[PDB]
Amino acid sequence: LSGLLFLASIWHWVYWDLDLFRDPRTLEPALDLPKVFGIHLVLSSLLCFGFGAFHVTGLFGPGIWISDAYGLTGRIQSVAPAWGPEGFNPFNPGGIASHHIAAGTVGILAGVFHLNVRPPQRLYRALRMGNIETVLSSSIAAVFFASFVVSGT
């Protein structure tokens, strides 16, 4: 995978002037970051739902590492989703499954919205959605949030 991505990187460096990156009205480099976010969110959410519903549940996948309360009988096992409040127990494996499923679904919905509805002009101006560095800022924020979370867990 590393090798293939390497070659692909070389190609995209060489052939940089693709028409896909140009704006038809100005012939300037432009990325429609909101719609791109829509697509990527659809991909991510679909993959999330898939991972939760098949890989974790064992419906079509191995499952997750589960053990007893004292870590003596650990093994890979199929995990049924816990939809109740007990799914929000950080030590309940079921939660994992349900989470992804649920999150996935919601994500997909959001995707649809972000694929169809254009951003509010005032939000577009406020968050500078014409500049990619705002995407960088927000992404970095999300990333260190997630980092603190996984450090905690």
């Binding site: 800022s137 970095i140 260190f144 603190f148």
Partner: peptide, 12 residues
Amino acid sequence: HANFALLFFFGH
């Protein structure tokens, strides 16, 4: 990951 998180707070 804790330290990376802090530093990324700056980056943000």
